[PDB]
Amino acid sequence: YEEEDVICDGCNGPVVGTRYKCSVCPDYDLCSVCEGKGLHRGHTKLAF
Ligand SMILES: [Zn+2]
Ligand SMILES: [Zn+2]
């Protein structure tokens, strides 16, 4: 089967917990840690 997963564009691990997906960049995601460290902070993100 094809497993769908979201990998953080900062630590390159999978996103567990909150997912911070950029609203501007296509297909860019950060985990809660990388988000806290201020990566990609110049773009609005979707925190679901
Ligand atoms: Zn991360
Ligand atoms: Zn972006």
Numbering used by the authors: -3 to 44
Share the article's original sentences:
Intriguingly, it was recently reported that the central ZZ-domain in p62 plays a critical role in the recognition of N-terminal arginylated BiP/GRP78 by the Arg-tRNA transferase ATE1.
Therefore, we determined the structure of the ZZ-domain in complex with a variety of N-degrons comprising three type-1 N-degrons and five type-2 N-degrons. As described for the R-BiP complex, two aspartic acid residues, Asp129 and Asp149, bind to the α-amino group, and Asp147 forms a hydrogen bond with the first peptide bond, which means that these interactions are conserved in all different N-terminal residues. However, the side chain of the N-terminal residue of the N-degron is recognized differently. Our structural and biochemical measurement data showed that the presence of tyrosine or tryptophan at the primary position resulted in relatively high affinity because these side chains contain polar atoms, oxygen in tyrosine and nitrogen in tryptophan that can form hydrogen bonds with the side chain of Asn132 of the ZZ-domain. Our structural information clearly explains the affinity measurement data as well as previous pull-down assay results showing that type-1 N-degrons and only a subset of type-2 N-degron peptides (Phe, Trp, and Tyr) displayed binding affinity with p62.
